[PDB]
Every structure is written in structure tokens, then in C-alpha cells.
């Protein structure tokens, strides 16, 4: 009837934020396969988030009509009214991947999430007046990028790795040297196969206790080279990334709507996923149009823009976005699910 | 011990804390310096959003660790 090949997700009330994330993770093929692999045989279908994700993924992959997510929200232990509260999509991502990661611990797919999304950074501190240096390596699953005053993703990363002065009110604690003035600089040691970028589109205004969303123009490319920001680069694997998904937030955080644009196969063929409606779109509708900064405009167009970006490493693309067939789904799973399409029938 | 927090303005500030401090405590110390209500704060470290109730030692947050402060863009 329509031609996208993909199905949407029904909105339960205010779950657009959840639907955008789910499409985003469903099309992270390698992760979907890992989830299908989780041991859900002896799980209570009403308390199991892993069974709920498997179910949502299976439907998205086989159904020909919008998919529901009530069993998913039920496995979170939520009551119906909880589906009517708006939420931040990056927040859902942090909490969900952590939950699924822990549930994967002890299983054959244990460690899958860190493998796909976790990277490492190095923080360098140095005292200006005392000869003392100290490093700190830290993992990350996404990068919050500074937007204000930044024209694009490059100026943003340049800003992320920029050395800062640990001055006056924030002087560095050396130890036996006490509070000293120092410089702090951050570099990346590794960038993951799948890169999640959170655009810092906020600022807190003291005269309202409110977060006023930053709708300024901020450009991000289809192709994103990041070798410049690695402490040490690798010739056989440059940190060249390809845009996969654009999570778009519309409105002020006084009410908004989430939608996600993806090119599932990483082939530049984009589609827009707005809850139950999946439609083919142009590259510009997914990219440029979500740069933001359309002011003096008295419309929603000004407050509609990219919040979260998903890039996939060029060298990992064919693996991360590997085709998933029924061959990849466990008989035990398929059967349990089809026995449900039954049990919900004769009743 | 001293830890760091990258604020909304993209600047790194210091916080004096103890391993047993709760995330609620930390959010509190941030309100003092940045003036942001704790209920609006989201602290991200090692890919995890720090849970109120838990403490710094629960997340193995040591001296010089850097936390990442973000707000929210709620949508439905």
C-alpha cells in the first residue's frame, strides 16, 4: 500500500520519545541480533524487559502494521498513566542501555552494548606553577557536544578537546601542593562502532528557573572524520563516521514532539519515523532541515531541530548494519511469540 | 576529594566531595555554584545517568573524575 518497507510504532499517549529510541536501536542491526539472542525462555512475559524488546523488534521486523509498546512499558513496571508523561530521549537511552546491559551480563551476548557504544577518553591536568601532571581515563557511551556559539560539529569537538584553565574559584587540588592553577584538556582514546552524540541544546535562565532550549543553527555532516580528536590514530581504521539517525525534538521543554530520521542501511536512503507513520524523505529533510536557527520565524520551524545524532564508523558499518533474517531469530523465541498470537485468540 | 563537572556552558568546575556523598548531595553542591535546581539536573558518568540515592563510591567515582551535566528536552 505505502512504500517504505518499514513500520511505525503506536503512540500510547506521550511515548514519542520511546518510539524514536526504539527505531534507532532496532536499526542498529548488530544490537537487535544480540537482543534476539538473549535467554528469555523462562521469563515472566509481564516483567521481562528483554522479552518485551524482543517482541517489539520481532513485530517491527515482520508486521505490516504499526507496532504497540504496551507490553514494553508494562515490563518497565509502569502503570498506564506513566505512558502520558513526556521524557527526554537521551535520558531514556542512558537508562535503557544500562538496564539491557546488566540483563545481558552472564549470558552469551554479555558485553554487546559496551562493544557497540562504549569509548574511552583521557583527561590531562597540569599545574602552571608547580611541575605536576595527572591523567584520568574514562569510558563514555555518548558525547555531549557544546552548541552555543558553535556553528557545527567540528567547532564543537574542537571545543570539547580545548584546554581549559582551572582558575580562581575552580583551582586544581594538587595534594601536598594545595589549591593550584592548572590546565585541563580532554582527548579521545577510542571512538565506538556506533557513536551517539547529544547536542547540548539548553541553557538555564535564573529568572524563571527554566531551561530555555537553544534553537540556534548547528550544522552536522553526512560524513564525519574524527581522527583529529583521537590521541593516536590508526591507518587501517580512520575514525570516519557516517550519519545513520537524527533524533529531532520539536518545541520548548514545555511540551515537545520527538521524531527520528534514519537511513537504516547507511546508504543515504532516508525515511522519517513519526510514531505510527513512516515516510520516505530527502537527505535535506533529514539533515539540513534539522540544523535549526530559523528565527524571526514565528513558527514551530524555529524550535524543531536535531537533539541527538547517531553516526556509525565506516569500518564497522557492514557489520553493525548486517542484514538480519529469520535465521538470526531463535526458534524458541519465534515459537513463544507465535504461541502468544494464539493465547490472545481462543483467548 | 576534588572532582569535576562539565557544566551546561561547557565549562569545567570543581566540586569538593567525599566517596560517601549521595548523588543528591552532589546535585546540591552544583546548585550552589551553578544555581541550577537539582530536580532539573542529570549527571552522566561512564555512560550511566547517576541515580539519586546511590553514592559516589557506588559508581567508583574517584578524585579527578569528571561528571557531565545535562538538562532535559522532554517530548511525547
UniProtKB/Swiss-Prot annotation, chain A:
Expressed in neural progenitor cells (at protein level). Widely expressed. Overexpressed in prostate cancer. It is found in: Nucleus; Cytoplasm; Nucleus, PML body; Chromosome. Disulfide bonds: none annotated. Residues 7-314 form the USP domain. Changing residue 249 to A: Complete loss of activity. The active site is at 16 (nucleophile), 257 (proton acceptor). Changing residue 16 to A: Complete loss of activity. Localized in the nucleus and does not inhibit FOXO4-dependent transcriptional activity. Loss of ability to deubiquitinate CRY2. Induction: Up-regulated in regulatory T-cells (Treg). Down-regulated during neural progenitor cell differentiation. Transmembrane segments: none annotated. Isoform 1: Phosphorylated. Isoform 2: Not phosphorylated. Hydrolase that deubiquitinates target proteins such as ARMC5, FOXO4, DEPTOR, KAT5, p53/TP53, MDM2, ERCC6, DNMT1, UHRF1, PTEN, KMT2E/MLL5 and DAXX. Together with DAXX, prevents MDM2 self-ubiquitination and enhances the E3 ligase activity of MDM2 towards p53/TP53, thereby promoting p53/TP53 ubiquitination and proteasomal degradation. Deubiquitinates p53/TP53, preventing degradation of p53/TP53, and enhances p53/TP53-dependent transcription regulation, cell growth repression and apoptosis. (Microbial infection) Contributes to the overall stabilization and trans-activation capability of the herpesvirus 1 trans-acting transcriptional protein ICP0/VMW110 during HSV-1 infection. Belongs to the peptidase C19 family. The C-terminus plays a role in its oligomerization. Monomer. Homodimer. Part of a complex with DAXX, MDM2, RASSF1 and USP7. Part of a complex with DAXX, MDM2 and USP7. Interacts with MDM2; the interaction is independent of p53/TP53. Interacts with DAXX; the interaction is direct and independent of MDM2 and p53/TP53. Component of a complex composed of KMT2E/MLL5 (isoform 3), OGT (isoform 1) and USP7; the complex stabilizes KMT2E/MLL5, preventing KMT2E/MLL5 ubiquitination and proteasomal-mediated degradation. Interacts (via MATH domain) with KMT2E/MLL5 isoform 3. Interacts with OGT isoform 1. It is linked to Hao-Fountain syndrome: An autosomal dominant neurodevelopmental disorder characterized by global developmental delay, varying degrees of intellectual disability, autism spectrum disorder, poor or absent speech, and mild facial dysmorphism. Most patients develop seizures. Additional variable features include hypotonia, hypogonadism in males, and ocular anomalies. This is Ubiquitin carboxyl-terminal hydrolase 7. It comes from Homo sapiens. The chain holds residues 208 to 554 of 1102 of the full protein.
Curated annotation (Swiss-Prot), chain B:
The modification (Microbial infection) ADP-ribosylthreonine is found at residue 66. Changing residue 68 to G: Loss of DTX3L-mediated polyubiquitination of histone H3 and H4. Phosphorylated at Ser-65 by PINK1 during mitophagy. Phosphorylated ubiquitin specifically binds and activates parkin (PRKN), triggering mitophagy. Phosphorylation does not affect E1-mediated E2 charging of ubiquitin but affects discharging of E2 enzymes to form polyubiquitin chains. It also affects deubiquitination by deubiquitinase enzymes such as USP30. Mono-ADP-ribosylated at the C-terminus by PARP9, a component of the PPAR9-DTX3L complex. ADP-ribosylation requires processing by E1 and E2 enzymes and prevents ubiquitin conjugation to substrates such as histones. The modification Phosphoserine is found at residue 65. There is a cross-link at residues 6, 11, 27, 29, 33, 48, 63 (Glycyl lysine isopeptide (Lys-Gly) (interchain with G-Cter in ubiquitin)). The modification ADP-ribosylglycine is found at residue 76. The record marks 68 as: Essential for function. Changing residue 74 to G: No effect on ADP-ribosylation. There is a cross-link at residue 76 (Glycyl lysine isopeptide (Gly-Lys) (interchain with K-? in acceptor proteins)). It is found in: Cytoplasm; Nucleus. The record marks 54, 72 as: Interacts with activating enzyme. It comes from the Eukaryota. Residues 1-76 form the Ubiquitin-like domain. Exists either covalently attached to another protein, or free (unanchored). When covalently bound, it is conjugated to target proteins via an isopeptide bond either as a monomer (monoubiquitin), a polymer linked via different Lys residues of the ubiquitin (polyubiquitin chains) or a linear polymer linked via the initiator Met of the ubiquitin (linear polyubiquitin chains). This is Ubiquitin. The lineage of its organism: Eukaryota, Metazoa, Chordata, Craniata, Vertebrata. The gene is UBA52.
Amino acid at each position: 500500500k505505502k512504500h517504505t518497507g518499514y513500520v511505525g510504532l503506536k503512540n500510547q499517549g506521550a511515548t514519542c520519545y520511546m518510539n524514536s529510541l526504539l527505531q534507532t536501536l532496532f536499526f542498529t542491526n548488530q544490537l537487535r541480533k544480540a537482543v534476539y539472542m538473549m535467554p528469555t525462555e523462562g521469563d515472566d512475559s509481564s516483567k521481562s524487559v528483554p522479552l518485551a524488546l524482543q517482541r517489539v523488534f520481532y513485530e517491527l521486523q515482520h508486521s505490516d502494521k504499526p507496532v504497540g509498546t504496551k507490553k514494553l512499558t508494562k515490563s518497565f513496571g509502569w502503570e498506564t498513566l506513566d505512558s502520558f508523561m513526556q521524557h527526554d530521549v537521551q535520558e531514556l537511552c542512558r537508562v535503557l542501555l544500562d538496564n539491557v546491559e546488566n540483563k545481558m551480563k552472564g549470558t552469551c551476548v554479555e558485553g554487546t552494548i559496551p562493544k557497540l557504544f562504549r569509548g574511552k577518553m583521557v583527561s590531562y591536568i597540569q599545574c602552571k606553577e608547580v611541575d605536576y601532571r595527572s591523567d584520568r581515563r574514562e569510558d563514555y557511551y555518548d558525547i555531549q557536544l557544546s552548541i552555543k556559539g558553535k556553528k557545527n560539529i567540528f567547532e564543537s569537538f574542537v571545543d570539547y578537546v580545548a584546554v581549559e584553565q582551572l582558575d580562581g574559584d575552580n583551582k586544581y587540588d594538587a595534594g601536598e601542593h594545595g589549591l593550584q592553577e592548572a590546565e585541563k584538556g580532554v582527548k579521545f582514546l577510542t571512538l565506538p562502532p556506533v557513536l551517539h552524540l547529544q547536542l547540548m541544546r539548553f541553557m538555564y535562565d535564573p529568572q524563571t528557573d527554566q531551561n530555555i532550549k537553544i534553537n540556534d543553527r548547528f550544522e552536522f555532516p553526512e560524513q564525519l572524520p574524527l581522527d583529529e580528536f583521537l590521541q593516536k590514530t590508526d591507518p587501517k581504521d580512520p575514525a570516519n563516521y557516517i550519519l545513520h539517525a537524527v533524533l529531532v525534538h520539536s518545541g520548548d521543554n514545555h511540551g515537545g514532539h520527538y521524531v527520528v530520521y534514519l537511513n537504516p542501511k547507511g546508504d543515504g536512503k532516508w525515511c522519517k519515523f513519526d510514531d505510527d507513520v513512516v515516510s520516505r524523505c530527502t537527505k535535506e529533510e533529514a539533515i539540513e532541515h534539522n540544523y535549526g536557527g530559523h528565527d524571526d520565524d514565528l513558527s514551530v520551524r524555529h524550535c524543531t531541530n536535531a537533539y541527538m545524532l547517531v553516526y556509525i564508523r565506516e569500518s564497522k558499518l557492514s557489520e553493525v548494519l548486517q542484514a538480519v533474517t529469520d535465521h538470526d531469530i531463535p526458534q524458541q523465541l519465534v515459537e513463544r511469540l507465535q504461541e502468544e498470537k494464539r493465547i490472545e485468540a481462543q483467548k | 576529594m576534588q572532582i569535576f563537572v562539565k557544566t551546561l556552558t561547557g565549562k569545567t568546575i570543581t566540586l569538593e566531595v567525599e566517596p560517601s556523598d549521595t548523588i543528591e548531595n552532589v546535585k546540591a553542591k552544583i546548585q550552589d555554584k551553578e544555581g541550577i535546581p537539582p530536580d532539573q539536573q542529570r549527571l552522566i558518568f561512564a555512560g550511566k545517568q547517576l541515580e539519586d540515592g546511590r553514592t559516589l563510591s557506588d559508581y567508583n567515582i574517584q578524585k579527578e573524575s569528571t561528571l557531565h551535566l545535562v538538562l532535559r528536552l522532554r517530548g511525547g
